[PDB]
Short mmCIF file of C-alpha atoms and ligand atoms in Angstrom, two decimals:
data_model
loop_
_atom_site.label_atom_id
_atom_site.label_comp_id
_atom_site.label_asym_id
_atom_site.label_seq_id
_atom_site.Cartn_x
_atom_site.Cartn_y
_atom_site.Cartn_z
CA UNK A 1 13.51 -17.31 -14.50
CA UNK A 2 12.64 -13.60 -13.86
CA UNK A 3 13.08 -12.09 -10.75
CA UNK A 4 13.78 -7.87 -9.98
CA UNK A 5 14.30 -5.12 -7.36
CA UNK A 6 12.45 -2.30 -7.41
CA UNK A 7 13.59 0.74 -5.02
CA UNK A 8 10.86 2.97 -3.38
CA UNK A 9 10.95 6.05 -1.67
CA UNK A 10 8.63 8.00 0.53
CA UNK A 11 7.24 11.08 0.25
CA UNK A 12 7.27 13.84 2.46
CA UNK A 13 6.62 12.30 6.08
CA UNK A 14 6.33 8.88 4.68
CA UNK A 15 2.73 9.87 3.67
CA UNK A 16 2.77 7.20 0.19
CA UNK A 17 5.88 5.41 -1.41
CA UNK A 18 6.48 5.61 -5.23
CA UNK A 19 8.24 3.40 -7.66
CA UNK A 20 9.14 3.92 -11.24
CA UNK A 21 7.47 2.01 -13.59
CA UNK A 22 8.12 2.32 -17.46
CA UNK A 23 4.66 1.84 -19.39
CA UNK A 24 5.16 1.69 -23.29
CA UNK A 25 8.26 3.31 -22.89
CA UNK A 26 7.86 6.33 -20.58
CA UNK A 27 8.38 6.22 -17.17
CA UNK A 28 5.95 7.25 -14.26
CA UNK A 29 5.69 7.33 -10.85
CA UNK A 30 3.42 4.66 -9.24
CA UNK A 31 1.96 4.14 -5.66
CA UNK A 32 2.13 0.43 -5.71
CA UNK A 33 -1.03 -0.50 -3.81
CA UNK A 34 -1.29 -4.13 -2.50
CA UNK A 35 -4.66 -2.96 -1.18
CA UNK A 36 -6.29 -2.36 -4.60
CA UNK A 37 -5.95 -4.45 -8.23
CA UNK A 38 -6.15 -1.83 -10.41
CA UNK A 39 -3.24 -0.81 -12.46
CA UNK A 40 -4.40 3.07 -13.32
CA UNK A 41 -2.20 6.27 -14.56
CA UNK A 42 -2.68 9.48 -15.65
CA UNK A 43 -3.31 10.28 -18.90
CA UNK A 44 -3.51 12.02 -22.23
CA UNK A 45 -7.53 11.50 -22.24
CA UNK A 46 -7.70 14.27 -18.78
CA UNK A 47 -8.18 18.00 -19.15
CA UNK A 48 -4.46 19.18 -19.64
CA UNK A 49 -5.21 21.51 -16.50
CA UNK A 50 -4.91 17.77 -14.42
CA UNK A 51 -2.36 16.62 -16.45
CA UNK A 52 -0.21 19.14 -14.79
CA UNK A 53 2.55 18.34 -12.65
CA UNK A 54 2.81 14.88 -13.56
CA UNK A 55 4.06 12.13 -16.09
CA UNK A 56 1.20 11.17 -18.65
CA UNK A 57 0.77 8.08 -20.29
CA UNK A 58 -0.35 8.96 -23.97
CA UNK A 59 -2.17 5.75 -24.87
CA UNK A 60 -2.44 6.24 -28.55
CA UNK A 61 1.84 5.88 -29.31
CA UNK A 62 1.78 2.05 -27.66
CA UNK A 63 -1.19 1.16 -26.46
CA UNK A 64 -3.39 -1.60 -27.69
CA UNK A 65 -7.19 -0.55 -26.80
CA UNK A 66 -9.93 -2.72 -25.31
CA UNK A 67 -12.55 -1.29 -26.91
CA UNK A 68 -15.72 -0.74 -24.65
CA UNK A 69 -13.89 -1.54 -21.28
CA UNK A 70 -14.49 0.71 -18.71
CA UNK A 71 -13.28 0.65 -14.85
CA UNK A 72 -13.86 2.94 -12.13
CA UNK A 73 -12.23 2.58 -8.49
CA UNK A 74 -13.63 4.67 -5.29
CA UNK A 75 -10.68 4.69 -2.39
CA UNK A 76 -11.09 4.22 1.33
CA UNK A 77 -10.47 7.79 2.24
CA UNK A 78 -13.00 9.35 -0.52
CA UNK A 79 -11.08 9.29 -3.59
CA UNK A 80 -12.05 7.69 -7.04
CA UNK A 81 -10.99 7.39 -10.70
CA UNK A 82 -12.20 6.59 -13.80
CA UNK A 83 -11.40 5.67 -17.53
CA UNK A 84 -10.94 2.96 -20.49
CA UNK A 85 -8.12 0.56 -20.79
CA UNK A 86 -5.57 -0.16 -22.95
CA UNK A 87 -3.00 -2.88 -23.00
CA UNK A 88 0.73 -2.22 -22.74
CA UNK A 89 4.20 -3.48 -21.65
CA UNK A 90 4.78 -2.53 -17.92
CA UNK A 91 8.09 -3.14 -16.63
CA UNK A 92 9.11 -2.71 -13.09
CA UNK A 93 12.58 -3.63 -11.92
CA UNK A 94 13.62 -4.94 -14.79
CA UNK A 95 10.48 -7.62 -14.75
CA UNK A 96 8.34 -7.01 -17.61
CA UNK A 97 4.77 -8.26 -17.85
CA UNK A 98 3.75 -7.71 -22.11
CA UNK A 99 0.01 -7.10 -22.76
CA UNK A 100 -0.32 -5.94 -19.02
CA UNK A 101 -3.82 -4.14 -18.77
CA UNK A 102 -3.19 0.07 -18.08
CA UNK A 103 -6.48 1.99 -17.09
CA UNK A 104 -6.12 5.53 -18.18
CA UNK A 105 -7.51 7.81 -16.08
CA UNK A 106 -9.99 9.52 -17.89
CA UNK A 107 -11.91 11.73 -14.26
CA UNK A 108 -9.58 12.02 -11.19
CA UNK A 109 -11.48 13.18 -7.97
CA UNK A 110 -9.60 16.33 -6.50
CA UNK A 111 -7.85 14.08 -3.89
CA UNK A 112 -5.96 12.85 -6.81
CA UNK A 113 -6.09 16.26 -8.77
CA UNK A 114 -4.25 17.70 -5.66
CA UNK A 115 -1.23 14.54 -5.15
CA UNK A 116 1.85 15.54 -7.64
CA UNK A 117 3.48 13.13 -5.99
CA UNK A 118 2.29 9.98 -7.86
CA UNK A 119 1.65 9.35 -11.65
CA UNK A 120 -1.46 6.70 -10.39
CA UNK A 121 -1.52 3.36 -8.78
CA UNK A 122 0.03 -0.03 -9.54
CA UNK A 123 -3.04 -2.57 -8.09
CA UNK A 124 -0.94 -5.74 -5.89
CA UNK A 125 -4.35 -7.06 -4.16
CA UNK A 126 -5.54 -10.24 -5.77
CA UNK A 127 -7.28 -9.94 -9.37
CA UNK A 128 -10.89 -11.02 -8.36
CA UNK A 129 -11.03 -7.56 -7.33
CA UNK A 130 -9.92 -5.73 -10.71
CA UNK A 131 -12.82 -3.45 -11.51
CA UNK A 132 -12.33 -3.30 -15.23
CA UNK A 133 -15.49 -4.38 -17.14
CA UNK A 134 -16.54 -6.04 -18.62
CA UNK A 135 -14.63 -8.38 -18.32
CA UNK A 136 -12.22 -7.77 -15.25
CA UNK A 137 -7.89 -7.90 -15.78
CA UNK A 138 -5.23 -9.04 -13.95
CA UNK A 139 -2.57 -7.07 -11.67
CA UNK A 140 1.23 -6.51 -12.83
CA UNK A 141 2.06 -9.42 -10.28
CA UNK A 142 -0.67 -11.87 -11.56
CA UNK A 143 0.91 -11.38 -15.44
CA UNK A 144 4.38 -11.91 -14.76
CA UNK A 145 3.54 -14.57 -12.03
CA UNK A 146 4.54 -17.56 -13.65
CA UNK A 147 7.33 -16.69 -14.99
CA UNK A 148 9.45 -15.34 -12.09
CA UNK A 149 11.27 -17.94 -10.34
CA UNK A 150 9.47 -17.80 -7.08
CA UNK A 151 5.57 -16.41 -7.16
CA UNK A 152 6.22 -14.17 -4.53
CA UNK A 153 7.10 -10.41 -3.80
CA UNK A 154 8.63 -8.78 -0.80
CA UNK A 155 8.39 -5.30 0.92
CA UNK A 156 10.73 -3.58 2.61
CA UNK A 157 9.54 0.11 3.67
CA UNK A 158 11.39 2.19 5.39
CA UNK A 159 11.26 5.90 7.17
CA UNK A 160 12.80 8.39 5.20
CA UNK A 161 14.72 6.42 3.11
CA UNK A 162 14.47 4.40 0.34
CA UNK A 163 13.31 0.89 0.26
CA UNK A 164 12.85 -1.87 -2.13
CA UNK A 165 10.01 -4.18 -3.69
CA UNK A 166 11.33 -7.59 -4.86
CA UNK A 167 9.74 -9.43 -7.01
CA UNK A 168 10.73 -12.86 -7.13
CA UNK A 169 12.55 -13.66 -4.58
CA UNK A 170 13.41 -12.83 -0.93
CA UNK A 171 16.27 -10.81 0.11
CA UNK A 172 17.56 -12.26 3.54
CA UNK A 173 20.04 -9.87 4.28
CA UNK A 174 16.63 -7.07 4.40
CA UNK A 175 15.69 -8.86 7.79
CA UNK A 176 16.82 -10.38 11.49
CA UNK A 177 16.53 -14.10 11.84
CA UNK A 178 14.07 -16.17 10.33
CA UNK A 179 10.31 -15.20 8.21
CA UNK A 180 7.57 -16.33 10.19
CA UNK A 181 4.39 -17.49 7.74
CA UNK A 182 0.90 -17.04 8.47
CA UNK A 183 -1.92 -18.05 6.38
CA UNK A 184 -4.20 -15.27 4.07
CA UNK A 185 -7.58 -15.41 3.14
CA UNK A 186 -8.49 -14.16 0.05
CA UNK A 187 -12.04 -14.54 -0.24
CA UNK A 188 -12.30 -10.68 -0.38
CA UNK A 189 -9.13 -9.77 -2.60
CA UNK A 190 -7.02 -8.95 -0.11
CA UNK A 191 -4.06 -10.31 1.96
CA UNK A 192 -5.87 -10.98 4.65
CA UNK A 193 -4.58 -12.61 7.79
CA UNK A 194 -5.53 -13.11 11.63
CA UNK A 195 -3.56 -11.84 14.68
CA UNK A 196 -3.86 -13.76 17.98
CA UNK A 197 -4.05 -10.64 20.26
CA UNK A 198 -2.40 -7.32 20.73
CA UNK A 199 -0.30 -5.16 23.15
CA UNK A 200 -0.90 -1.32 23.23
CA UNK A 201 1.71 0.11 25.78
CA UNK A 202 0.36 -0.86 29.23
CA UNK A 203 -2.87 -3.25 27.78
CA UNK A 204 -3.45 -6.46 26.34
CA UNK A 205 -6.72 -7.68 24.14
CA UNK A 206 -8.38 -10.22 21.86
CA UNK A 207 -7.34 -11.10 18.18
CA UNK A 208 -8.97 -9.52 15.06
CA UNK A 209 -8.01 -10.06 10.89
CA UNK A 210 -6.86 -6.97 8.89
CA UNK A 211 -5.40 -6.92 5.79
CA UNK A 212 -1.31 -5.87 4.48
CA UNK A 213 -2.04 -2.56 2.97
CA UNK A 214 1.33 -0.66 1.17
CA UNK A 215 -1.26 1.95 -0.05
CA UNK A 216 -2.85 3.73 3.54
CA UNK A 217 -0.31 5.54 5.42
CA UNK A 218 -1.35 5.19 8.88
CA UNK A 219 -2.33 1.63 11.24
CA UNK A 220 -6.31 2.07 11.22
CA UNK A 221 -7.68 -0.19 14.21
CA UNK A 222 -10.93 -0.34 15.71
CA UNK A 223 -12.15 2.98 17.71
CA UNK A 224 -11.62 0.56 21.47
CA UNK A 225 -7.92 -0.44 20.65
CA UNK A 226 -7.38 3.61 19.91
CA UNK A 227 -8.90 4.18 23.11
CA UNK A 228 -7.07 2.23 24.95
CA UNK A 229 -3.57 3.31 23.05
CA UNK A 230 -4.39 6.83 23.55
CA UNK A 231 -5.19 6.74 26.78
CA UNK A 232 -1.98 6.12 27.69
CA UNK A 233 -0.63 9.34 26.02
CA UNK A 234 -0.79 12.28 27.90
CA UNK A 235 -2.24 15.27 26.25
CA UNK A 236 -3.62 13.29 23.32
CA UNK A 237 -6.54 14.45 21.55
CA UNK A 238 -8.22 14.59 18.28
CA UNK A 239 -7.89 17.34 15.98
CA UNK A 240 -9.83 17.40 12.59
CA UNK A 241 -7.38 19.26 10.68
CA UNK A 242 -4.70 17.34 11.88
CA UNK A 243 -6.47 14.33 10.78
CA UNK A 244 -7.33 12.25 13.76
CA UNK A 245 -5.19 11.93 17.87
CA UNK A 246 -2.51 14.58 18.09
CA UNK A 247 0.47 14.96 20.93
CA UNK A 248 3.27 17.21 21.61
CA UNK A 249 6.18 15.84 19.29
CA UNK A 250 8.18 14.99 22.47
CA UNK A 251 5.93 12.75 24.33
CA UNK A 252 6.84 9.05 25.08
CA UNK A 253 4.82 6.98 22.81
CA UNK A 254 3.82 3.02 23.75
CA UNK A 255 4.98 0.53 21.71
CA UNK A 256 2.38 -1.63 19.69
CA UNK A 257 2.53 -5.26 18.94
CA UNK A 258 0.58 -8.01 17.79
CA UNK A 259 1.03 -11.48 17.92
CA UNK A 260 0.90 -13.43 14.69
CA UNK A 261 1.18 -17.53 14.68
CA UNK A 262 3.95 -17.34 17.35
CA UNK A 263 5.71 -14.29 15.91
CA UNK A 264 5.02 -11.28 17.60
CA UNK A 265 5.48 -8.01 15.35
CA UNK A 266 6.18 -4.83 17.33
CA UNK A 267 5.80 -1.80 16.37
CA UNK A 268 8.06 0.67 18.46
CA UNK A 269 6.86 3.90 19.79
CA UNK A 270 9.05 6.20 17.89
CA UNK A 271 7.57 4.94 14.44
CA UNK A 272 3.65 5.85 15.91
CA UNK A 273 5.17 9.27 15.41
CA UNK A 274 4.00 10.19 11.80
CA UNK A 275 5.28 13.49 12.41
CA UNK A 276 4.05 17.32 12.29
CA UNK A 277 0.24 17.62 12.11
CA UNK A 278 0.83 20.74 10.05
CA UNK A 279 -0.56 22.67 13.07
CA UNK A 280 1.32 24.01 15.81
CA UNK A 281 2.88 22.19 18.04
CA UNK A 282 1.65 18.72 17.82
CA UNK A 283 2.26 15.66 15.75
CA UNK A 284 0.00 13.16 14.52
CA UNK A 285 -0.45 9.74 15.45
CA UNK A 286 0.36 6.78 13.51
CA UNK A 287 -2.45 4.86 14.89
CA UNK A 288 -5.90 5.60 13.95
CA UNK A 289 -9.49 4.92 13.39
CA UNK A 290 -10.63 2.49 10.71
CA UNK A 291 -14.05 3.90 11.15
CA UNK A 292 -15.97 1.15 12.14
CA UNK A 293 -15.16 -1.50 8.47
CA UNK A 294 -14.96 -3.90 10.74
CA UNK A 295 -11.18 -5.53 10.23
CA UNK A 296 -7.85 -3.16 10.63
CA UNK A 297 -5.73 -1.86 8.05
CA UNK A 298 -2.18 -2.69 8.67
CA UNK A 299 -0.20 0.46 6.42
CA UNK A 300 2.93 1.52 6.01
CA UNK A 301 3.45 2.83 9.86
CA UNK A 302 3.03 -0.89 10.59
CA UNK A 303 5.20 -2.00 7.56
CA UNK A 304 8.04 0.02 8.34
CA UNK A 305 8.85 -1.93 11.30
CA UNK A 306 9.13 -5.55 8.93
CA UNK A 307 10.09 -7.12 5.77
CA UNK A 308 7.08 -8.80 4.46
CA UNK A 309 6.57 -11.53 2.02
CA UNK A 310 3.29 -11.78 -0.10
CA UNK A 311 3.43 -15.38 -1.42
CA UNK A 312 0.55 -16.63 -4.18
CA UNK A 313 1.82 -20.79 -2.46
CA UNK A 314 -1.27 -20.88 0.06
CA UNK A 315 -1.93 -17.83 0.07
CA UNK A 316 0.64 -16.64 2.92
CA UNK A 317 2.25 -13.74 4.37
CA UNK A 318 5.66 -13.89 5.67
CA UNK A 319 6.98 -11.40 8.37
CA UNK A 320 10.51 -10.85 10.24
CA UNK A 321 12.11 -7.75 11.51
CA UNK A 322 13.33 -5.07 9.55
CA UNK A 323 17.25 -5.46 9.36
CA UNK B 1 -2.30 10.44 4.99
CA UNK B 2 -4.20 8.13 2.24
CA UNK B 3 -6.10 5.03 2.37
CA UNK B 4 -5.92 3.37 -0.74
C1 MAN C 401 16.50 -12.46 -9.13
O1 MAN C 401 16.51 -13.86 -9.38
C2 MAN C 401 16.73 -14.18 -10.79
C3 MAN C 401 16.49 -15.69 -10.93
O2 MAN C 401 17.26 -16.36 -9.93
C4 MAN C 401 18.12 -13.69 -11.18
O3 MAN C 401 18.38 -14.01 -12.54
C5 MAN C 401 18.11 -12.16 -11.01
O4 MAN C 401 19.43 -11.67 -11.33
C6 MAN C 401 17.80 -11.80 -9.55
O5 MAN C 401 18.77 -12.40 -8.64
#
C-alpha cells in the first residue's frame, strides 16, 4: 500500500505554500490547491519571456498528448490559465500516480506572469470540477486514490516554517489530542463543511458553510463578521493597496473561533497578523472580505492553526490542533 | 495574498 510525505514551505509572509513535484522527470514547484482540480504547470508551449524565472515542463520529452483537449481555469482573485493536456507520471512524496493528466499552460494572466514563486498548481478539490474538455480528468489524489493504504490526505501548514502534506495516512504526533470529523458536501467540488457559530473577540453569531481552501492566503468571511472583528481593533481601516483592514503591527488582535460538530477551532490573534502591508507602518489583516460569494473561504491563516484531514470515506474533514 |  502507498502512502508519502510531502514537505511544504511558505513563501514570503506565508502568502502560498509550494511543494516539489517531479512531472516526467523534472521537478517543479507546485501550489497544491485543494480549492481547484486542475493539475496545470508552466510550460514549453509559453512565450520564453514567461517562461522566465521558473521550472518548465517540456511536454514533448514524456508526455503522452490528448489530442484536442483543452482546459482553461479563471481564479477567485482575477487570475486565469489556459492550454492542452498531456498525460504524464506525477510523483509527489514518493507516491506516484502514472498517466496522471498535466495541463500545460499555454496563456498565463499577468497575476501568474508576475508569481516566480510557483511552477503552477496541483488541483486537490474533487474531480467533478476538472475543467479539461472534453472530456474532464481526474486530480493527482483521485489517480493514486486507490492504491494508498488509507484514501485520505492530511495538512499541516505552518508560519514560517515548513510543513508537510501526507498522503495516505495521518501523522498523530502533527496534532494535540484527538481529530474531530465533520461531514463535507461535495455537490459543488469542494470540501465543504458547516460551522455551528463563531466567536470574533468580544461577539458571538450564527453558523454559515465555507469550504478548506490550501490555495487563498487569507480567512475571507462575510462583510458583517469583518465588521464586527474589526470593530474591535483600534485604528483599523481599509487600505486598497494594502489589500483590504490594516492596523499598527503592535495592536492586540481578537482571537477567532468557530465551532465545528463539538470541536471548536480557534484561531489565535497573533496568526490574524499576516504581516507588513508593504506600506508604512501597518500590517494587514488575516481576516477579510469574501466579497459577497455567499459561503467563507477558510485559507491558510485559518489552516495554520490545525492539522486537517481530507478523507474521500463520507466525504469528511477531520480537524485537531496544531501540535 | 491569492485566492485560488
Ligand atoms: C506510509 O504508509 C505506507 C503504508 O503503510 C508505508 O509503507 C510508508 O512507509 C509510509 O509509512
Amino acid at each position: 500500500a502507498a502512502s508519502g510525505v510531502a514537505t511544504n514551505t511558505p513563501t514570503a509572509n506565508d502568502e502560498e505554500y509550494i511543494t516539489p513535484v517531479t512531472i516526467g522527470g523534472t521537478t517543479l514547484n507546485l501550489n497544491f490547491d485543494t480549492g481547484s482540480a486542475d493539475l496545470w504547470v508552466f510550460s514549453t508551449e509559453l512565450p520564453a519571456s514567461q517562461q522566465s524565472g521558473h521550472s518548465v515542463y517540456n511536454p514533448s520529452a514524456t508526455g503522452k498528448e490528448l489530442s484536442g483537449y483543452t482546459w482553461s481555469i479563471s481564479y477567485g482573485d482575477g487570475s486565469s490559465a489556459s492550454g492542452n493536456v498531456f498525460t504524464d507520471s506525477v510523483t509527489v512524496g514518493g507516491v506516484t500516480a502514472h498517466g496522471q493528466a498535466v495541463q500545460a499552460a499555454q496563456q498565463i494572466s499577468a497575476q501568474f506572469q508576475q508569481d516566480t514563486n510557483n511552477d503552477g498548481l496541483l488541483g486537490l478539490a474533487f474531480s467533478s470540477i476538472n475543467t479539461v474538455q472534453p472530456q474532464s480528468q481526474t486530480t493527482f489524489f483521485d489517480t493514486v486514490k486507490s492504491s494508498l493504504a488509507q484514501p485520505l490526505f492530511a495538512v499541516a501548514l505552518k508560519h514560517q516554517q515548513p510543513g508537510v502534506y501526507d498522503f495516505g495516512f495521518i501523522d498523530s504526533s502533527k496534532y494535540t489530542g484527538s481529530l474531530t470529523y465533520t461531514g463535507v458536501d461535495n455537490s459543488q467540488g469542494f470540501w465543504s463543511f458547516n460551522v455551528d457559530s463563531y466567536t470574533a473577540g468580544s461577539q458571538s453569531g450564527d453558523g454559515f458553510s465555507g469550504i478548506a481552501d490550501t490555495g487563498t492566503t487569507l480567512l475571507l468571511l462575510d462583510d458583517s463578521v469583518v465588521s464586527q472583528y474589526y470593530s474591535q481593533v483600534s485604528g483599523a481601516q481599509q487600505d486598497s493597496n494594502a489589500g483590504g483592514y490594516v492596523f499598527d503591527c503592535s495592536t492586540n488582535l481578537p482571537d477567532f473561533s468557530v465551532s465545528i460538530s463539538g470541536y471548536t477551532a480557534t484561531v489565535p490573534g497573533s496568526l490574524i497578523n499576516y504581516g507588513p502591508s508593504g506600506d508604512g507602518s501597518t500590517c494587514l489583516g488575516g481576516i477579510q472580505s469574501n466579497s459577497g460569494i455567499g459561503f467563507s473561504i477558510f485559507g491558510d491563516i485559518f489552516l495554520k492553526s490545525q492539522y486537517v484531514v481530507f478523507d474521500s470515506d463520507g466525504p469528511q474533514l477531520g480537524f485537531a490542533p496544531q501540535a | 495574498x491569492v485566492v485560488x
